[PDB]
Symmetry: D2
Subunit: 140 residues, 4 copies
């Protein structure tokens, strides 16, 4: 179901209706320290100049990093949400795929930090995103 971590019986929004399902994000691997995801480039991921949208690299990074955090902390009664995302853009992507790899670099009680690499089909580093993920007690 994008292969997102299956941690609850019900979710407020179905995959195919989320921004994630609309653009086509799919999680490949997930462990507590490292996760990967990818997306096919289609026009839905593009801006009007024909390049993948800045927003798309950020969105990918945000979903991957946050859900990799959810995968661990949800069963502990915690919620996780993106608190900061800093994406820098080194080379455009015009077509093909964008592949993300999220590497956990700090896991604190209140904040987890992941470095996310975004690569094209040739494996070139096209963008990076520093995701900071707030972890808080789940509200009833």
């Amino acid at each position: 179901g994008g292969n997102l971590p299956d941690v609850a019986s019900h979710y407020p929004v179905a995959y195919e209706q989320t921004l994630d399902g609309t653009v086509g994000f799919v999680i490949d691997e997930m462990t507590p320290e490292r996760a990967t995801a990818s997306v096919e480039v289609t026009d839905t991921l593009r801006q009007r100049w024909g390049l993948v949208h800045g927003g798309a690299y950020c969105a990918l990074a945000d979903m991957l990093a946050t859900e990799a955090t959810v995968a661990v902390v949800h069963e502990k009664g915690m919620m996780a949400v993106g608190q900061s995302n800093h994406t820098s853009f080194f080379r455009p992507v015009k077509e093909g795929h964008v592949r993300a790899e999220a590497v956990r670099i700090h896991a604190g009680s209140t904040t987890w930090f992941w470095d996310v690499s975004l690569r094209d089909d040739a494996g070139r580093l096209c963008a990076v995103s520093s995701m900071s993920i707030a972890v808080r007690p789940r509200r009833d």
Copy 2:
């Protein structure tokens, strides 16, 4: 132009309705060399599975608005403008209504323009901010 993006060219590689921005429904309202605003109606297409506006939607709205506000000035001078850095911080979730973005230009260098983008909900509350750095380079085209 679809979504009211600056009309600086006779044709574009991708039509508004097919782009990310068209799909989620970004619309530019005001646009000047120093300030631009835009908004979007929150629908599931903007949300993630937990029912909140996706962190990506805030980045994407900031990026399009800051880059395009730059394009509006520099295109006719023979330059291209692309996002080189986006730093968004998230203060409060948005569940529904609209997200409204205001981009204020704070530095316009020869190679880099910098815009601060505030993203408010329907009550006026500041829900996210984005610092956009836009690279300006001469067109290869």
Copy 3:
């Protein structure tokens, strides 16, 4: 005492020995939503190419933003520390002063966010820093 907020009887490090006192940071105004500080440029604030050190704009922003948060939350039993600092550098400063103005934009239970402008003697915007300040219960 740099005019930092006077919130405790004793501090681990005296002003004149801190990095702050060494380079000469002084707070001018402080309120819960807004604070200002400045520094004279001397070689101690410079790098070897003769420009004010990138580190100096960051340090100024960090001390101003954090201590403006301390000023409010300390009496509530909370500690405040910088969690993130993103500084962008628009124009160098060679001599004169650097003047900072910190404007609080979000004050949450666990995080306060301040935007800090760094200006030269002509009033030009030479750098900005986005400070994110973690606020936590003081440890005994």
Copy 4:
């Protein structure tokens, strides 16, 4: 050169011992086009009043090391290199001992180089990271 900064010029505007870097005691150890390391001994001059290493010291060490690692390559090609963006996040305080920085180059464009700098304490723990973006421009000099 003082602090072992790259020797790329016959003279410099400010001597090592008088600079910020000289004052707090930054020392570069290794230095290659793709990776550079540096360290500093924590003393009060590096701390803020609450007794922790100042957030500014971590930025300053990252900035000097990333910029100078870039200078080392580009100076002899007629370019200058200055810090254009520094994003430091703080994971754990350092009270004493040393701070050790490792800068790894992750992108080397024609106008912008990007370095990830990790800042560890004496136990090897990751206490801060800094993302440094370095602008490369032709010298006016």
